[PDB]
């Protein structure tokens, strides 16, 4: 339901977006380094409004994912941590910048703490420090601060230091089952139900140990949606890495199920980010559709660029619909994105979309190419993007050109068909069509009208076209070989006829008559020529038979004018008039023998001229 051309604003981002999509394909083909996310990051940062900031952060989410082997849970946590860390940098060692964030926003104007029961050592809430270090991804710093405070945390928490070192010195960020059972017992016996317990201490225990998965949120320290997302993401394990699945478990699907069950109602100005961070990529695309088709389409391209994946091919072919006619080349640019998913049906779906674009817009020269002045083909945009099509083939291009050609012929688009058959390199068919077009022009265009005007060209004028095809093809051994010898001959004969018609139109009677005799079609020679040419008539090519009537009319008319000219002196005027009258006579006898295969008016036109001689 989107129409890109309906206003300056809605048309300016389209080309701005299409231009990114364009150099993406360029690096795609050039095997380059282009990164679409940071291009949309650049354009989206200047704009604003809430959805734009929403969209802007979503691309920064996609950008962070780049060059990372993609584990949904891991990249999601890395995003939320690096964002918080940079937040504490914007606000201002990392440890001292987090310390200052703590002293600032955890304290009321009294210098009182907003959270009660904080364990405070030298004015530093050490469990809040450990926690926010973890919240920033600074695991080794977080373990560090716990270590320095070993002499200030009694013995109940002393054991926790060993579980932390273990959690920190690993890659799985999991604990050996002997540790997770010990830590869970200690959590249940001392921490979980503590009366005056520090809430950050409880959060850190729960995060490091995955203690008590029945309660996933610590609301007292969950100060933002990002915190809620991070804390859940922190608790997810793979199914095959659950130490005690019948007691408790938490997987990514569990996390996605509750995000879905809550819906956007519970996710404020953050639902698109939440869907993206939870790995619900289709839902994030679908949600984006509710407010901007253009940004939805392009977010899908971003997600396809990352191999993350309504259906891509239909997403891309639907976006194209409002500008297929207006902008055929950029339509190709988006249809070619269909092979980002690299699927067995994706390649075929992209082919069928391209074929539909060509057959429907009939934009043959931009999409399929055109013939240069020398006869050499200039590639169209589909051909220029052939690498991106993953073609086994160039067979595809050939096949679509031939289909457009037969449709052209069926529709009566003669010029289209001649252009397409040239592109398909169907050279004998081209000369066949050109001969048919020139022959029909010569026989059907009223005789006294001119055939070529000062502003006619080789693309649309039948005489100028045939001349161009003869010049660029017949003297090209590679091409000329492929044109039947008689099709070449019919072409040159028709062209000689068109030269005769021009001389005639220009009142060059004598020279018209001389070129006429060189055709070797009419009986100029003697009495018996009429009989010979009459017999030949039934064997003439279809292209020629229909032009015999005008040739007879030109001949009789040229003789009639030349006899008047001779009678208005010279020694042998009589012999030249007798000779001319002889040609008229032979032509009239020939004409009378073939006249019932001629138009019914031809003979009558002819003999009315003959008796004036």
């Amino acid at each position, epitope marked *: 339901r989107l129409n890109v051309n309906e206003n300056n604003i809605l048309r300016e981002k389209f080309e701005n977006y299409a231009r990114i999509v364009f150099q993406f394909n360029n690096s795609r083909q050039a095997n380059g380094n282009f990164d679409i996310a940071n291009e949309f990051i650049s354009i989206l940062s200047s704009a604003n409004g809430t959805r734009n900031a929403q969209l802007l952060e979503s691309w920064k989410i996609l950008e962070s994912m780049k060059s990372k082997d993609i584990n949904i849970v891991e990249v999601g946590k890395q995003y939320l941590e690096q964002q918080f860390l940079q937040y504490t940098d914007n606000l201002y060692t990392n440890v001292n910048k987090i310390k200052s964030f703590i002293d600032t926003k955890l304290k009321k104007a009294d210098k009182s703490w907003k959270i009660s029961n904080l364990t405070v050592i030298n004015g530093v809430p050490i469990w809040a420090l450990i926690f926010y270090l973890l919240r920033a991804g600074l695991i080794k710093e977080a373990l560090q601060v716990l270590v320095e405070n070993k002499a200030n945390i009694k013995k109940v928490e002393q054991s926790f230091l060993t579980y932390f070192k273990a959690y920190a010195s690993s890659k799985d960020h999991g604990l050996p089952v002997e540790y997770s059972t010990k830590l869970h017992t200690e959590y249940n016996q001392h921490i979980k139900s503590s009366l005056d317990g520090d809430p950050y201490r409880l959060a850190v225990y729960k995060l490091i140990g995955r203690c008590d998965l029945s309660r996933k949120n610590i609301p007292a320290v969950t100060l933002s949606i990002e915190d809620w997302l991070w804390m859940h993401l922190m608790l997810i394990k793979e199914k095959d890495a659950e130490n005690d699945p019948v007691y408790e478990r938490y997987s990514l699907e569990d996390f996605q199920n509750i995000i879905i069950s809550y819906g956007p109602s519970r996710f404020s100005n953050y639902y698109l980010q939440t869907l993206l961070l939870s790995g619900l990529y289709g839902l994030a695309i679908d949600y984006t559709y509710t407010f901007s088709e253009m940004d939805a389409v392009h977010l899908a391209i971003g997600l396809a660029s990352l191999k993350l994946f309504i259906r891509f091919a239909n997403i891309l072919a639907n976006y194209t619909k409002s500008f297929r006619y207006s902008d055929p080349r950029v339509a190709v640019e988006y249809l070619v994105l269909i092979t980002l998913n690299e699927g067995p049906t994706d390649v075929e779906l992209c082919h069928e979309a391209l074929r539909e674009l060509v057959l429907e817009t009939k934009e043959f020269t931009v999409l399929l190419g055109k013939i240069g002045r020398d006869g050499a083909r200039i590639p169209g945009v589909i051909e220029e993007r052939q690498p991106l099509l993953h073609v086994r083939d160039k067979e595809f291009l050939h096949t679509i050109t031939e289909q457009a050609a037969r449709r052209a012929d069926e529709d009566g688009r003669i010029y289209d068909s001649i252009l397409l058959y040239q592109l398909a390199e169907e050279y004998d068919i081209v000369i066949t069509l050109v001969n048919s077009l020139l022959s029909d022009t010569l026989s059907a265009s009223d005789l006294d009208q001119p055939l070529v005007g000062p502003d006619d060209n080789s693309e649309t004028n039948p005489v100028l076209l045939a001349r161009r095809m003869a010049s660029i093809y017949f003297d090209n051994a590679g091409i000329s070989r492929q044109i*039947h010898v*008689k099709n070449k001959e*019919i072409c040159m004969l028709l062209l000689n006829i068109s030269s005769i018609r021009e001389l005639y139109f220009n009142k060059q009677w004598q020279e018209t008559l001389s070129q006429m005799e060189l055709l070797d079609l009419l009986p100029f020679s003697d009495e018996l020529s009429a009989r010979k040419k009459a017999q030949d008539f039934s064997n003439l*090519d279809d292209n*020629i038979v229909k032009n015999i009537p005008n040739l007879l009319i030109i001949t009789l008319s040229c003789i009639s004018n030349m006899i008047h000219i001779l009678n208005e002196q010279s020694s042998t005027k009589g012999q030249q008039i007798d000779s001319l009258k002889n040609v008229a006579r032979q032509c009239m006898i020939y004409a009378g023998m073939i006249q019932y295969r001629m138009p019914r008016e031809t003979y009558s036109t002819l003999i009315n001229i003959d008796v004036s001689l």
Partner: nanobody
Amino acid sequence: VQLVETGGGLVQAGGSLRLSCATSGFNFRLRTMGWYRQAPGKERELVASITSGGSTDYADSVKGRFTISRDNAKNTISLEMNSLKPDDTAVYYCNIWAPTTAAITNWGQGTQVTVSS
């Protein structure tokens, strides 16, 4: 495309035969068409060809004796063969004319023509 060659069969030397080919499934009018023969052992060779407009051209082998024609209304091609010789015995195929016979790769079943004596 489909090429249904009929006509022909066995005939005594010096006799006459008329081959025909009913076509379907392509636009007949725009194509130069040809009649070919394939003698046992020998390769398939071009015997006669005809442009869209009815202009014809013949191999020396059959000049004066064979006559190719076409009917663009009925989408048929025909080959009248007169004063036949046993050297003309072969299977005869009708197909689009092309400069090098090997490249066709899209034919019909053909009609066998055999001339005795």
